[PDB]
Amino acid sequence: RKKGKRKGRGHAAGQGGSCGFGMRGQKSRSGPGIMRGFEGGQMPLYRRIPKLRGIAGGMRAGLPKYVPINLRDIEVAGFKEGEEVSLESL
Amino acid sequence: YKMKTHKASAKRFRVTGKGKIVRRRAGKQHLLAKKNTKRKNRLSKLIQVDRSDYDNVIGALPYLKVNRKV
Amino acid sequence: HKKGAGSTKNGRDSKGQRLGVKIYGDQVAKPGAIIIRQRGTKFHPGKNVGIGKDHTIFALIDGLVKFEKYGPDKKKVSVYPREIQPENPNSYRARKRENFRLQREKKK
Amino acid sequence: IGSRQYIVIPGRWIYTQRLKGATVNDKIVLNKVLLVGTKASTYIGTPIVTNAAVHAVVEEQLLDDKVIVFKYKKKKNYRRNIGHRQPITRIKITGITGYEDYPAST
RNA sequence: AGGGUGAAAAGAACCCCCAUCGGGGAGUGAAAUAGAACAUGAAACCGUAAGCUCUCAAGCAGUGGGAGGGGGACCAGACCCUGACCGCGUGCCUGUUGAAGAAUGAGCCGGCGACUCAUAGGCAGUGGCUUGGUUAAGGGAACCCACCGGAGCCGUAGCGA
RNA sequence: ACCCAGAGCUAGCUGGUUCUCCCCGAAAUGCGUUGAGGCGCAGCAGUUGACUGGACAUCUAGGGGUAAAGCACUGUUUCG
RNA sequence: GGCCAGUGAGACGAUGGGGGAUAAGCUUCAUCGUCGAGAGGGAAACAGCCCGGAUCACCAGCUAAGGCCCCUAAAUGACCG
RNA sequence: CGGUAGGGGAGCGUUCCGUGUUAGGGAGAAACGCGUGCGUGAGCCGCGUUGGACGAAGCGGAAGCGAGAAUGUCGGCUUGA
RNA sequence: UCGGAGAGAGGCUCGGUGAAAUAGACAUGUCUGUGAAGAUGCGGACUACCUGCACCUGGACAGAAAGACCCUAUGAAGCUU
RNA sequence: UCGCCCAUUAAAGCGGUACGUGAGCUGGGUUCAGAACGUCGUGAGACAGUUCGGUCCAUAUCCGGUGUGGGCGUUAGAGC
């Protein structure tokens, strides 16, 4: 149990009177910050790069079928006449 | 309430098996005739996002399973 | 008293393109390492050394770079591998990296 | 004593720096006696007279009254208050052992 | 906006000042240094009394040195109050490249008066399990809570649109 | 117009943000920006892991066209 | 490389220059000092110059920069101009 | 071991809860005002007066938890006189 | 020009009642110097018993209204095509 | 303001003091709203272009000044 930062209660406790936000400006003010990923009016990365071939209008991503096991992974779970190694036993 | 994913960005950043963010290169949609055979091959392929901009990308979509190498 | 200031017709440039000698004389190189970005052939291509479309001069082989004298008032660039490169644990660098390593190991 | 001079006469006490290693009641001899005096006083050529050694007794090793050290700078929210009680020692002088050397005084 | 005499009105018979108000004795009561403006009663602000002390001074008012005087029914080179005269010493905050500033803010004193909570995501510290881990709603002589509920979730295979 | 409600509207703007000690300790730059007193990323703080050897000092080797100097080139210039 | 900040108005001085009138406590770059965020001593007072980097105590001592008639620590010191 | 923005570590108090219908308390608690104790500090600790019934530690927990600045705000009281 | 005299209502004194804006703290001199470049507060000088009342407004960048000019805000609102 | 001119005169000096002085005065000029002329503007409106009309606060705390008292001081106290 750490005991957190009740913030702005004397300059000895440290993070006091402005509370570790420096000096005015957008990040100082109360309320929401900005958009997250916002590059300041410069074109954001997330909107100046093309979008990943298949995911650009249709084409559902290759969601996996088959529930792959391996022969390496079976050997650890041992049974002599391994009676139907299937969806049931595993 | 429970974080919405930034599905504008998500569609430009995929994550690979080992856990690195990957993007497509910019440039090669049109005005292709005037570029070389050479540079279109470098613009075809995927690379990592630069270590600088990981912060914004991870911050945008928080259900990635992305490993900053630790 | 308050007269008008005449505009200029100047104020254009291009940010320095970063040409010049990337790999210096008597220095390590690689197969493929760019030695010089020069705008024309200030230096000329020597042996063991490619010369590109932009008069870019790059090394083909390992070895140290050499700026030879061409004949009548010009410069060449060739590359030569080096035979044997000896290291002695006598010296100060060797002493100190082993001392450091041993301290590292001693602590943990 | 603690790189610090004192006129010292017998049957009489002094305050000094806390003597490291000294007990509560424990007599000691001070061997740095730069001067002695009487009817016929006696200076020193070098330092210490020669074989003169003042004879004293430790009393107690209590701390000094609190001195308040206070760092302050104007307008920077830099008030820093800190006390300090220097440890001292009380010693009581029993006698001066006689000089037997270099008699001055005309 | 404006609560709290006392356990009990026992709320002051009588006397004095006196037209009233109010006051002092008396009386009641554990208490009236609880008297109705009544319980604890801080500060600013207003006085009264005692110790020292300013009318040739100049000063952000203190500070280091300390003349002369005074103590506390408790015998100290200890301690406290005053303070002749000397040296030093450009109120605080905000906010600036830079503020004693003649930049901003506060008449003073007391209260109230500001990074919180809910839910998620990342990271660290700690703990439990590691036969992988964990249950959600929901059920519980309610709420917590034994004890159930494995539905789901996370990890166990990537590559490619 | 007023009154009540949306409504604690929003305010990249100004003011304000309360106990103590110890350790480290910046920046006021580049880049982009309907941006210029804002923001992003880099640069420079703290903190915690991993990789190694440098730091300061002296001595060599490299390519430079600057101070200097010069009039063979490019201009400019005086006298015969 | 992980987690998590502030900063993004700078100022003066030395030098190398530009702009200006080789005016400005002017302005803009480049290299370094100090302030900024740094007390103390020298500069009468005096952010930015010189000396020097304040953990704390001492009614000890040696010195840097700078000084030695009095205000006010130290030579009304010396010899030659 | 100077330090603004700023980051990290270590603490003190405030009311309330568990322990606790604890001991301590009308031979005097909370409070209120004074201390020739203590601590690096926030603070702690004993005192007999006023006061008239609540309520320490220690080990733990939780917040309407610390004020001098907001032309803050409510109340009191000055100054000008 | 160029003022002068006089009457009322104040002003002044005594008794009665009794406000105000303002106000970090105020033991609140002049000169020149210094400094955020215009000092009762910093340096050097000069001048100056302590304290009322009447008159006067040069200063306290006096009081009054978070400049109404100027510019800024990817502020508000009217009006135009 | 400056300036020109009339009548003079010994002469009709030039400057600093927030281009001295608005908590001393004035409000003619210039920085609000009305209205007009010329002009610019498709228009609303505009123009150190012009014209007419248009609210100037204050009980002196301190320093500072002009006056005028009181206290105390001047070493025993007084009047000249």
Swiss-Prot record, chain A:
Location(s) in or outside the cell: Plastid, Chloroplast
Compositional bias of kind Basic residues: 1-10
Protein name listed in UniProt: Large ribosomal subunit protein uL15c
Role according to the record: Component of the chloroplast ribosome (chloro-ribosome), a dedicated translation machinery responsible for the synthesis of chloroplast genome-encoded proteins, including proteins of the transcription and translation machinery and components of the photosynthetic apparatus.
Biased composition (Gly residues): 11-23
Known partners and oligomeric status: Component of the chloroplast large ribosomal subunit (LSU). Mature 70S chloroplast ribosomes of higher plants consist of a small (30S) and a large (50S) subunit. The 30S small subunit contains 1 molecule of ribosomal RNA (16S rRNA) and 24 different proteins. The 50S large subunit contains 3 rRNA molecules (23S, 5S and 4.5S rRNA) and 33 different proteins.
Family in the record: Belongs to the universal ribosomal protein uL15 family.
UniProt organism field: Spinacia oleracea
Swiss-Prot record, chain B:
Source organism, top-level taxon: Eukaryota
Cell compartment(s), UniProt: Plastid, Chloroplast
Family: Belongs to the bacterial ribosomal protein bL35 family.
Record's subunit section: Component of the chloroplast large ribosomal subunit (LSU). Mature 70S chloroplast ribosomes of higher plants consist of a small (30S) and a large (50S) subunit. The 30S small subunit contains 1 molecule of ribosomal RNA (16S rRNA) and 24 different proteins. The 50S large subunit contains 3 rRNA molecules (23S, 5S and 4.5S rRNA) and 33 different proteins.
Role: Component of the chloroplast ribosome (chloro-ribosome), a dedicated translation machinery responsible for the synthesis of chloroplast genome-encoded proteins, including proteins of the transcription and translation machinery and components of the photosynthetic apparatus.
Name of this protein: Large ribosomal subunit protein bL35c
Lineage, top ranks: Eukaryota, Viridiplantae, Streptophyta, Embryophyta, Tracheophyta
Gene expressing this chain: RPL35
UniProtKB/Swiss-Prot annotation, chain C:
Any one of the GO BP annotations: translation
Protein function: Component of the chloroplast ribosome (chloro-ribosome), a dedicated translation machinery responsible for the synthesis of chloroplast genome-encoded proteins, including proteins of the transcription and translation machinery and components of the photosynthetic apparatus.
Protein name according to UniProt: Large ribosomal subunit protein bL27c
Quaternary data: Component of the chloroplast large ribosomal subunit (LSU). Mature 70S chloroplast ribosomes of higher plants consist of a small (30S) and a large (50S) subunit. The 30S small subunit contains 1 molecule of ribosomal RNA (16S rRNA) and 24 different proteins. The 50S large subunit contains 3 rRNA molecules (23S, 5S and 4.5S rRNA) and 33 different proteins.
This protein's GO CC annotations: chloroplast; ribonucleoprotein complex; ribosome
Gene: RPL27
Keyword presence, Chloroplast: yes
Membrane listed as a keyword: no
Sequence similarity: Belongs to the bacterial ribosomal protein bL27 family.
Segments for region (Disordered): 1-18
UniProtKB/Swiss-Prot annotation, chain D:
Protein name: Large ribosomal subunit protein bL21c
Protein species of origin: Spinacia oleracea
Superkingdom field: Eukaryota
Quaternary assembly: Component of the chloroplast large ribosomal subunit (LSU). Mature 70S chloroplast ribosomes of higher plants consist of a small (30S) and a large (50S) subunit. The 30S small subunit contains 1 molecule of ribosomal RNA (16S rRNA) and 24 different proteins. The 50S large subunit contains 3 rRNA molecules (23S, 5S and 4.5S rRNA) and 33 different proteins.
Family: Belongs to the bacterial ribosomal protein bL21 family.
Function statement: Component of the chloroplast ribosome (chloro-ribosome), a dedicated translation machinery responsible for the synthesis of chloroplast genome-encoded proteins, including proteins of the transcription and translation machinery and components of the photosynthetic apparatus.
Parent sequence residues shown: 129 to 234 of 256
Localisation: Plastid, Chloroplast
